[PDB]
Amino acid sequence: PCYEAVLPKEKLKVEHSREYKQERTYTRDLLGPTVSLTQAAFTPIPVDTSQIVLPPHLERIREKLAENIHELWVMNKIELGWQYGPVRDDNKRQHPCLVEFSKLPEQERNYNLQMSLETLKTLLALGCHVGISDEHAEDKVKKMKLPKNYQLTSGYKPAPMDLSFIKLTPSQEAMVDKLAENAHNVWARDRIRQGWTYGIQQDVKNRRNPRLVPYTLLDDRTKKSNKDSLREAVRTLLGYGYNLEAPDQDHAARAEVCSGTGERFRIFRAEKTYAVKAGRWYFEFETVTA
Numbered sequence: 527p528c529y530e531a532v533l534p535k536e537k538l539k540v541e542h543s544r545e546y547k548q549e550r551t552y553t554r555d556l557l558g559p560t561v562s563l564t565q566a567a568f569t570p571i572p573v574d575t576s577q578i579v580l581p582p583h584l585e586r587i588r589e590k591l592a593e594n595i596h597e598l599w600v601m602n603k604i605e606l607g608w609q610y611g612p613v614r615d616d617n618k619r620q621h622p623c624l625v626e627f628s629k630l631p632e633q634e635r636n637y638n639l640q641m642s643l644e645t646l647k648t649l650l651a652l653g654c655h656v657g658i659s660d661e662h663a664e665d666k667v668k669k670m671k672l673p674k675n676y677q678l679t680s681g682y683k684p685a686p687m688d689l690s691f692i693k694l695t696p697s698q699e700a701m702v703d704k705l706a707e708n709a710h711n712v713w714a715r716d717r718i719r720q721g722w723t724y725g726i727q728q729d730v731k732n733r734r735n736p737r738l739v740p741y742t743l744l745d746d747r748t749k750k751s752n753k754d755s756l757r758e759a760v761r762t763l764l765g766y767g768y769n770l771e772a773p774d775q776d777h778a779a780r781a782e783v784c785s786g787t788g789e790r791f792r793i794f795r796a797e798k799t800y801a802v803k804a805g806r807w808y809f810e811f812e813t814v815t816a
């Protein structure tokens with residue numbers, strides 16, 4: 527049905543195909559060239575990173591980095607209420623993910639590894655160089671006690687130094703936003719290869735999912751969920767000694783050059799017969815938008 531193509535925020539209305547309708551001449555809204563609706567087609571595009579090569583420091587740090595961050599999100603879900611179980615049904619509150627990376631299912635371990643690799647490759651394609659400050663930041667295992675019953679079976683508690691001691695700059699928040707953008711785009715392209723397409727209501731048999739939407743249009747709940755996850759990811763990436771310097775805020779306004787067709791402006795004028803050659807005249811112009 528055609529009602530399934532409505533964008534989430536907008537409401538379905540039946541409006542004139544052309545701009546101008548019947549109204550008062552002084553209330554008539556004169557419109558200029560409208561902007562092109564390129565956003566209508568949600569074509570995700572991740573930043574290309576296959577050509578990029580990982581620097582030596584990150585390629586020998588990542589493996590224990592990858593396992594440590596894996597244990598970090600398994601605690602995040604444990605705090606959220608995740609429970610280990612023999613069965614594979616997450617909705618039934620049973621999953622074998624609590625085990626270590628080696629004991630982890632090979633396909634899950636592979637996922638965690640390309641996502642570590644793609645997070646680092648996105649970090650390095652972001653224009654943000656990262657380097658380790660000192661080895662003491664990794665040598666220190668300053669640890670706060672947490673209840674054993676509330677913790678998992680494994681004695682090694684992945685809970686690192688409390689995150690309040692680390693700080694997140696506006697540039698850090700900016701790169702977290704772009705990293706979340708790239709992760710969303712990659713996931714969307716994955717479902718597109720799977721054959722999934724956008725819909726107003728989720729249909730597993732029809733491969734319809736409302737989340738196949740541009741990130742700015744995405745729901746605030748998944749926005750904040752993925753944003754916080756990548757937030758602890760980046761914060762641990764700093765607390766582990768590796769300091770990173772964001773590119774400075776570069777503001778290059780596009781000035782809305784892109785527009786429908788090649789029209790730059792539209793000119794409105796009275797009829798030539800009303801030309802005034804003498805006298806003193808006055809008329810008003812109202813600016814709806816600056």
Ligand SMILES: Nc1ncnc2c1ncn2[C@@H]1O[C@H](COP(=O)(O)OP(=O)(O)OP(=O)(O)O)[C@@H](O)[C@H]1O
Pocket residue numbers: 616
């Ligand atoms: N690392 C993970 N592996 C598997 N499931 C996860 C993981 N992290 C979270 N989940 C749970 O499974 C869901 C995975 O959905 P996601 O949008 O990431 O893609 P998907 O695996 O293709 O979809 P789904 O499992 O929902 O059909 C999450 O919404 C969450 O409930």
